Amino acid sequence: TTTVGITLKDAVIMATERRVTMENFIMHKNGKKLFQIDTYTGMTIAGLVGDAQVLVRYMKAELELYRLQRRVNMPIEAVATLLSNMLNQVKYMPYMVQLLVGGIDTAPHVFSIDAAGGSVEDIYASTGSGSPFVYGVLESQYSEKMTVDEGVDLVIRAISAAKQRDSASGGMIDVAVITRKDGYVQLPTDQIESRIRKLGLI
Amino acid sequence: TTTVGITLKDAVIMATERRVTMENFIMHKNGKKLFQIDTYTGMTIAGLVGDAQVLVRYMKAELELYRLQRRVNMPIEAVATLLSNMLNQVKYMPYMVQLLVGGIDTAPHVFSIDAAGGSVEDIYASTGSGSPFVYGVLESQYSEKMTVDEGVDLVIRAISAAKQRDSASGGMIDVAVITRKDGYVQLPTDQIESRIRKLGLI
Amino acid sequence: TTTVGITLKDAVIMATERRVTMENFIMHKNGKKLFQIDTYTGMTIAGLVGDAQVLVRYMKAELELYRLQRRVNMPIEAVATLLSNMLNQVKYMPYMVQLLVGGIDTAPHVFSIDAAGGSVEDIYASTGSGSPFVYGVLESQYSEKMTVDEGVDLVIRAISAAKQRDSASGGMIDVAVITRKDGYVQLPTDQIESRIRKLGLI
Amino acid sequence: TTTVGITLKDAVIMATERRVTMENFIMHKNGKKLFQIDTYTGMTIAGLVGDAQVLVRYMKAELELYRLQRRVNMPIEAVATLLSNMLNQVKYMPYMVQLLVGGIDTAPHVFSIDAAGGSVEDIYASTGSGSPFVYGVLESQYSEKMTVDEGVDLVIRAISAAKQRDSASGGMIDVAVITRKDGYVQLPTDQIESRIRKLGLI
Amino acid sequence: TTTVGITLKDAVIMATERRVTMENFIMHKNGKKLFQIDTYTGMTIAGLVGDAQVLVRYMKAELELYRLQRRVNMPIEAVATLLSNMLNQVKYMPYMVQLLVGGIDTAPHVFSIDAAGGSVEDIYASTGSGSPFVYGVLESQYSEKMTVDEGVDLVIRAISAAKQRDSASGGMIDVAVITRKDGYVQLPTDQIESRIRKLGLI
């Protein structure tokens, strides 16, 4: 698994691959690891599939109820805090997951949350077995001044590098762009493929 | 054990063999591993027999009650989601099973669900100890454009290959075809045998 | 890893992929797992790389010395027997490998040898983590009456199926054809690629 | 620890950092992990310091004796083979090391050798705990057509990325360039520092 | 991790670095380990991030509620006592943390609290893997007669020494100064950097 989230001037970009290992072989080449959980909030999952899917359902319900009861979206930091409390409360019987939460309330934000409820904000982050390869790409090429279009190309290149070296990763790359003006926009695969050819990644 | 489920244009085909190992020998050559759980929904089971049979009874009751209370059949994705919640809720005291759910609501669907509640949709899937042999056949011969008749021959060939190489599998092959026009139809054994001769599988 | 060897009328075809996992990631995408060890004899290796490479060097030396001392090539069955003795002699401190030996002396032969020195002749065989997917393809499509050209296409399709489902396998496919008339011939990659396009495997 | 070796048109570039952890803290910030072992041959070490230093002394003696007895340098592949035999011979009482051997005999070569004697040639390779970050940089930026000057900048950037993310790595970067025309040349630190400023790595 | 707290005539100085290890690599270089929990009270955390962040939230709520219900701030010793009771109550299912609490009620105070609820007042203290290096600096250079400005330079030098020798520590140094006249004041990074240059620490 390889997931990544980066922050730009007024946008958040999140991306994953799609390979789901089960029964110690490549059973599903087209899984889903990136989810929209609020109007301007997204989430990526790594680890046990069953635990992660349950958490996604819980977060969608809680955020929706919050927005109805309080007339505003839950702030991104509060989303991370709520997740941190739930995970820590069962730390000795834990959800074995690693999560990324990203979105926009008044500024872009990306949060990394571990199985024990530790939550840390960062300018960019990556999870899964392919993450170390991603950090190498991000360390040498990431820039805060990048445009949205440059950022999308960057995450695509980072995940492509991970797929070449981490056997647990593979499949088509999914990308989401979150802005206040346009909201949560899932990039259609046709542009993802077009960028892949343009970047020379075959 | 070998079970398989594939999706075609407007149909779902599911199939299993019948050998049930108990007390570390071939006690029952004529078990049942494929069940109809709703009007247009089917289920295959692999793993612990006792756990699987209990799950089959639970699913039949829940789906029947759902259809009475809401006047429509439960959608296939909701069937998988309900199963995922139940399995994950006891993940540390689990049902040691691997399940396939297939059916038609407005399009054909096949879902694979593991013991921890991980649920993934796929165009085709296979479970049990004979599954790797099945995936080899499906990878080289499956086509989305196949007719129903071609698909039935394909799953029969795939399971026959598994029976030649997986000692835990054996016995007569059961096949079910699910369509909106005809519903859940269990193919009579006479046609299964006739196809086996026609395909040269003795 | 995926290796395969099949026997035809008067030929032996052997093939592998090239991915070598080390330090729990895909360090080398272009390894070598298929070796010529005599004029009409070939060998494939699976398991610990270091153990396998040592065994390859030992076999090349022994076979070469045998042919010089006795003026004829060692028969294929004797090659398997020699390997069986060496592996069994250290069965409690073993080479953790699985081997395939194939060649022609007066008829084609393929032998499978395990870490404990068990040696069994077969019409075809496959080793490595991708082998179960290969057996599915071979069970449904192999025929003793195939021409050499048909056999090469068959092993290519079988390995391609394994690469789609076994994360430990990958890379370009190497193929060798052994006949009495032409000897040990390593197919150039240009024909391998050409066949891959012709078979629709991209 | 982070070591790297890459091959270019007619050159080999090898590089390491210098941090040596001992007694579970940063005791030595200025260790040595890159060694010249022959006229046109270099070696990098990762793992247990004591085991690695012993191996370096053995290789220097063997290569020197070889060149005196046979009037030519040992070929790079033979260097890797000799190492593979020694490591495998004690595989159950092993040197816990990971090694890179690079040099020029008639073409550039880089070999990766593990603790069990597995030896694989590659166009580039990296060892140590910082290696996954290096592979990310190399996957996205390496090109076979690079000049020597471009290659030196590449390995410097790759190691700098590893130092930002792997706590076991640190210190000044050492770089060696091997060519037939100039032999084994250890780049003076003054140029290494100058390149670091020029590349914007502070 | 490296945290430190010292007491002067009428002031408390607390300081940490920012490196947060997660997934056994340097994932976050800019974490937060120093928190204001009351008007004149501060807290530093070492150990499991998730456990520590939960404890910080609990302490902020309890102290705020205390001050509202009793019209005065909780005394520093009572803050330590409350923490000691909570940690000891779950000593067999513990928060795996080491904490420092410092502040002013009528005199400066620094308290060290372990995972089992042991609480001891001290003139200065340090926690985390870099703490032994800090104690060496404090033992040779600390003086009770130091001015606030001298104390800030001292803690900066102590943490800088730890960063040179403890790989688990790193990043920018955060410093807080607590006095009755000025309250809890977080030193801006610009002065921290300026002092670092002035002290010759690059």
Added chain:
Amino acid sequence: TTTVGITLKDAVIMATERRVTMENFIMHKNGKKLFQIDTYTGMTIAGLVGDAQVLVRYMKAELELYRLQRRVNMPIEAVATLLSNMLNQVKYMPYMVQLLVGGIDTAPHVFSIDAAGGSVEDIYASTGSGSPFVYGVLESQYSEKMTVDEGVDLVIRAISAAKQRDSASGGMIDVAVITRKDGYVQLPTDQIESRIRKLGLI
């Protein structure tokens, strides 16, 4: 135990304390941990007393024999290399010690050697349970430009700090100064005490 060795312009300074724990209490307050092993070479020991004392006897004999057979003293680097070979040869049945070797051949040198034979040269080093406290003092106060008199005061202060914080250390401090002009000179305790009063260490 606390031992330390530092290098200056043309001198080496080595120092230890004297507490020897045996039978889990402070049995001997006046042990010996610093030894002269050659005309211009010294050695400090930490770890198992019996193993260390045997090693000291071996080194004295080997160095003495070397100097008689070759008419010159063994170079310091060769002393470290000889030790490294002996320790590594029994790495699986090891001397559980940590050693420091220092001396002058044509320049001052200090070497740190671990139980597995890893040997690293450094400008200064410290061993034993009190070493982390020493590194804090050295990191903040050591300077290469110090005179011999300044260096002696520095090591005395460093060891005094360790004695305040490491219960395994204690007793009177022994100091040796090695120069080419004066040779190995053990400072009399009267000057050590006088410096301790002058430095305000009581």
Added chain:
Amino acid sequence: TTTVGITLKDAVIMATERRVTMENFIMHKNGKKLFQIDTYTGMTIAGLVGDAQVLVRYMKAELELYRLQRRVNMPIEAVATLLSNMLNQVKYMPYMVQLLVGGIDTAPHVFSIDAAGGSVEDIYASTGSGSPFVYGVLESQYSEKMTVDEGVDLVIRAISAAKQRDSASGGMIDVAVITRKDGYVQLPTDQIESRIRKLGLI
């Protein structure tokens, strides 16, 4: 840790040292291990700091409540009995402590209580890792006919001997004298120091 309690004609003398080991080093040189828990009752603690401090708070509350409800102080034997019941009630989830209780109701008393609730009265007793050294001093020098002044000198000498031989003990000695005429009197440190000089203990 070293604590001691002795009985004289009409007085009880209790004394401890102050060293508190935490994180396996001498973190706090000035801890508190001797507490007044009633008008004429004292308590010393050894073992886990957190467990001991909780017990001290419980005993202060219970004794205070007892004296208010029944108009008289709890007798010393009843104090020991109450402690014995509480410790034994959780014997399988125990407070890992060793306690001494001393005081005057109508005669002097000293009680020793272990972690399992065993309570035994004695003329004198000692706890902690330094206790065996104390018993040697008491066995050879204690006399029931000693004056209070002689007894204070005796406990000071006993603890000083323990500090010379038990590394877990250290720091300034605290002494309390309990009589009916004067109550619980904590000796000021100035007299403790003066006695230490007078007894020749430096």
Added chain:
Amino acid sequence: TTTVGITLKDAVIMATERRVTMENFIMHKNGKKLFQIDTYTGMTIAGLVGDAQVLVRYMKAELELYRLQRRVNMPIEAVATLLSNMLNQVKYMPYMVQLLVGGIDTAPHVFSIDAAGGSVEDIYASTGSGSPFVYGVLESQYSEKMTVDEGVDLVIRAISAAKQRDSASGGMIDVAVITRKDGYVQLPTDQIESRIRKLGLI
């Protein structure tokens, strides 16, 4: 077991008790633990009886042979060194003993040697389970200026204190006095008893 050895101006005094536990009860109340091994050399033993008795026989033979071959007694330090080498040579298959060696060559000496061959000279020392009680007595009462008669009374008092508190010790006290003028003199029991009455030890 309790053994002790002390040094005076020109004498060595050694003493033990006599209780030998075997089969987990007091089988022999009159064992022997103090032995003369040379003209002016004595030895005490603690630990496994069988191992200790074998060592005593070895030392008597070696010292006797040494004195015959070299015409002088082995120096006490050489006696300790010889013992240290023998014990360390079998450190992983060890004699489980603790030894004291004392005697006069040109000055009095006492050496303590552990099971791993660690040897340390001291002014006084004590071994066995009763040793901590002995150290308490020695710390408070030993003086270098004592006469021989005072020293004998001191060791008798120290061992008597151990017998009151260590259940593994008991029986009559044996005492030996070693001087150059009088040699090795075993005090007759009649004086030992007489001193015991005179000292008030019943």
Added chain:
Amino acid sequence: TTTVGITLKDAVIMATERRVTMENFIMHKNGKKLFQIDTYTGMTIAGLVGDAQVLVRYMKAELELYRLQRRVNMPIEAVATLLSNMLNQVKYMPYMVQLLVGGIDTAPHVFSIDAAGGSVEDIYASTGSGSPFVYGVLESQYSEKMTVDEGVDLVIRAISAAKQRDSASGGMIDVAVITRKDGYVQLPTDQIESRIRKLGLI
């Protein structure tokens, strides 16, 4: 520990020693192990001190309440039965004790009760580590026709023999005599000492 109880014509004699081992040394030489629990009933304890003391308090309360509610003393057999039920009820979380109950209701009785609640009446019995030595004395010398005075001498001799051979036993012997005419009578120590001299036991 050594306890004993014997029955005579119309009397019960019970006796113990007083040594209480704690912290693996002889901490208390004057413990109490024999208790009166009713007008004509006594009890001895062996094993864990804390468990035994709690049991003694429970038995005193229950017997006292029984006698008040039913106007007669609880019969000795009922005392044993009540104890048996309480111990067995927690057999898997047990009081680790061995008990003796003796007394007179209409005839003398002695009962032995183990940790699991097994209760057996006997003419005489002994518990503790010194018990086997006691049984040897009782087997050869006990007689049912002995007078009370003879019985007291017998138990004194039996316990004295145990003290000579069991290191866990020691101290002054306590003796109680129970008759209907005189009730529970604790023999004063002056007669115990007088008998000890008269019997030649020093």
Added chain:
Amino acid sequence: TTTVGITLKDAVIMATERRVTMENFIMHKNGKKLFQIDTYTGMTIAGLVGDAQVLVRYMKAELELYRLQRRVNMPIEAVATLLSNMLNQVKYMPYMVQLLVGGIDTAPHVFSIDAAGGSVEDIYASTGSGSPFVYGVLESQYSEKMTVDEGVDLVIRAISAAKQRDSASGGMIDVAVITRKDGYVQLPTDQIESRIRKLGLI
């Protein structure tokens, strides 16, 4: 098993019972555990039967050879010493036995030797599971002034007491009397039975 040996004025008396447990039941009621190994020397055995019988054969051969080569019997202390060396030499692969050696050379002697070669002389001793009961009898009734006839009655009574309480012991009692005047004399069973009736032991 129960064996015993006692010393009188000019005689040694040894005695055993005869029960040999094998296969966890009373297979042989009439074993032999007392052996004459020299003219005036006897031996008793406890522990593993096979180990003990081998040792008896070795001792008979060695003593016989000694007496032939040196014209005198081996002294009893030398017999014990020889045994001690043999047992200790295999202490880590030991004879699991406990032995008693008794005899007359110029005075009576009894030696006790354990499995590790520990050898201690005593006036009397006892081995086996029944030994603690024997020590109780001997402690209360043994006297050095007893005649031979009194001693024989004493050992008979001691063993009879052990047989009443140790289930591992039983059968007829064998007794041997060793004197210089009469040599090794095995008492005929008829007198043993006669004494048993006379002593009232049925």
